[PDB]
Write a protein that binds this ligand. Structure first.
Ligand SMILES: COc1cccc(OC)c1-c1cc(C(=O)N[C@]2(C(=O)O)[C@@H]3C[C@H]4C[C@H](C[C@@H]2C4)C3)nn1-c1ccc(C(=O)N(C)CCCN(C)C)cc1C(C)C
Length: 438
């Protein structure tokens, strides 16, 4: 009683946010104008898959929601009968060829960049996608002859042999072949790209491969069970099949409806990650030009790596004052900690960059700040033997006696590594503390 009503609520809900979701996606990518060519041609293939997803929701779902679900006689006529399975057939090819075409174009860009330069174009892609949608429609024409009305049911109008033949050809070159081709190229290209990686066009590639990875997986998730259902008709000849048929078909509508919401959601999340990742690399590498541009875009000043290394940790460690300066200018945290519990002041004192040590303190770095090891900036300056830094550290209220978990003072470490000059400074500095205390 409430079962049929339960599906209605879901199937109608999928139609609303699905039609709109894909609709919004089609208008979004239309107005979109990326400077990198690959970014555009990728989004033309995404826009092509959004149409395929939209057509399925507008034409097929209503026929399913009523005849297939709600009201178990055929009420759409032979024109609508042949049309339902035509459009549904046409969308599988359209989706399949796009998934392949995208992977081919994307593969070429990575593995044959110079060959691709002479071949690929926004113009040719935009045209070629029209040719896809034609071929998709032509390959779907057979299903017009393969279906008809009978006694009132839109049942097949050809032999089981000819029916088992078309589903075989359908499932082969509208799922099996494309998945196979996409999976091979998306693996060969990915391997090449991580090797090439180990800028604008290279950024578009990293995005493009990330997209195609998400596309193919999403494509395989929903269409596999659908094509598995089709495979049954070809080969197999108790009541689980009926349950599998309904779930496999329903999954297509769910995917088509949520994918635009997901893609839009995943984009923003990965965009946040990619911008943040870019800054960490840029700060460590010393490419100040990027860092300045990345900050304006809206990258998090207090991003952290797997270790817990923020831009200020990397910039101070590598010794890029220009970056350390602009990082603090864009509200970077001077007292930020990593895994071990090192502050930028630890790493600036470690490397020995005097100017950076001064700036960190001037912007309010913790001078006695201790890590889990028990070590402090003064220990690291004495350790490496930076006689200039120990001076400016001692100036800014540094605890000379402060010992670590190894029971060693900076004066001990200074004496240990036999930096005679630096060791004499701490002795005199320590004496002053006794007079100050007394
Ligand atoms: C041999 O076929 C199967 C074997 C095992 C599982 C299957 O699908 C889950 C199937 C199965 C596949 C299809 C199928 O592809 N149906 C079509 C399709 O939807 O793609 C339909 C009907 C024909 C014209 C077009 C194109 C296809 C063939 C629309 N229907 N169908 C199917 C589904 C349910 C029932 C059904 O209601 N049953 C009586 C289930 C009985 C199960 N006991 C045998 C245990 C019957 C079939 C066909 C055999 C006609």
């Amino acid at each position: 009683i409430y079962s049929k009503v339960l599906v209605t609520a879901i199937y109608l809900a999928l139609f609303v946010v699905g039609t709109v979701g894909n609709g919004v996606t089609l208008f979004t990518l239309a107005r979109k104008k990326s400077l990198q060519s690959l970014q555009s041609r990728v989004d033309y293939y995404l826009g092509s898959l959004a149409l395929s997803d939209l057509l399925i929701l507008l034409f097929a779902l209503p026929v399913d929601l009523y005849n297939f679900i709600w009201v178990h006689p055929w009420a759409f006529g032979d024109a609508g009968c042949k049309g339902y399975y035509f459009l549904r057939e046409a969308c599988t090819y359209a989706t399949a060829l796009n998934v392949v075409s995208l992977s081919v174009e994307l593969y070429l860009a990575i593995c044959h960049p110079f060959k691709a330069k002479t071949l690929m174009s926004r113009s040719r892609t935009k045209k070629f996608i029209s040719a896809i949608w034609l071929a998709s429609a032509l390959l779907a024409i057979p299903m017009l002859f393969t279906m008809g009305l009978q006694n009132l049911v839109c049942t097949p109008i050809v032999d089981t042999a000819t029916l088992r033949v078309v589903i075989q050809l359908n499932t082969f070159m509208s799922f099996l072949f494309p998945m196979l081709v996409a999976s091979i190229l998306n693996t060969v290209a990915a391997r090449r790209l991580t090797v090439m990686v180990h800028p604008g066009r290279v950024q578009a590639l990293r995005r493009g491969v990330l997209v195609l990875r998400a596309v193919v997986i999403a494509f395989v998730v929903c269409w596999l069970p659908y094509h598995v259902r089709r495979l049954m008709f070809v080969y197999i000849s108790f009541d689980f099949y009926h349950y599998f048929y309904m779930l496999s078909n329903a999954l297509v509508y769910v995917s088509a409806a949520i994918n635009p919401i997901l893609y839009n959601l995943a984009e923003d999340l990965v965009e946040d990650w990619e911008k943040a990742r870019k800054l960490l690399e840029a700060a460590r590498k010393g490419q100040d030009d990027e860092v300045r541009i990345l900050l304006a875009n809206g990258a998090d000043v207090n991003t952290a790596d797997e270790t817990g290394f923020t831009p200020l940790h990397l910039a101070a460690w590598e010794g890029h004052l220009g970056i350390v300066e602009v990082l603090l200018k864009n509200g970077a945290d001077v007292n930020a900690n990593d895994e071990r519990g090192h502050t930028p002041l630890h790493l600036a004192a470690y490397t020995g960059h005097l100017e950076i040590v001064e700036v960190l303190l001037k912007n309010g770095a913790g001078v006695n700040a201790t890590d889990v090891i028990g070590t402090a900036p003064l220990h690291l300056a004495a350790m490496w033997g930076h006689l200039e830094i120990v001076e400016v550290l001692l100036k800014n209220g540094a605890d000379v006696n402060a010992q670590d978990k190894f029971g060693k003072t900076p004066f001990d470490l200074a004496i240990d590594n036999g930096n005679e000059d630096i060791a004499e400074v701490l002795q005199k500095a320590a004496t002053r503390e006794l007079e100050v205390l007394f």
